[PDB]
């Protein structure tokens, strides 16, 4: 039914440049807080490691509506990239006013989740 996360911020808000496809695998529970877990898509980012993509400003909440000093949810963060695919869509955004997030991340129970980046360039 409602699939792990959205790309809200390039289908609403902007055109994708650049754009990578990362396999995020997940933990056995993690499908239900993953297929059930609500992440702000969106003034995300991610950081390009020539070799690893983290979540950077991409916060999982499967259902922590009472946060505190720091609640974690379950994602832990750290997205997988093909390093020739962190490089290359992740290289366009550092032109200038661009940003990058993984616009849509989908979520499997065989540890596959396929994650779509959009660089989105605002000039």
Known sequence: MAPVLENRRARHDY????TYEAGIALKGTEVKSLRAGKVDFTGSFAR???????????????YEKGSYA????????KLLLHKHEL?????????????????????????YAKVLLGLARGK
């Open 15 to 18: 055109e994708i440049l650049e």
């Open 48 to 62: 390009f490691e020539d070799g690893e993509l983290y979540l950077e400003n991409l916060y999982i909440a499967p």
């Open 87 to 111: 490089r290359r869509l992740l290289g366009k955004v550092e032109q200038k006013g661009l940003t990058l997030v993984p616009l849509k991340i989908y979520f499997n129970e065989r540890g």
């Open 70 to 77: 720091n609640v974690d949810p379950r994602r832990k963060r």
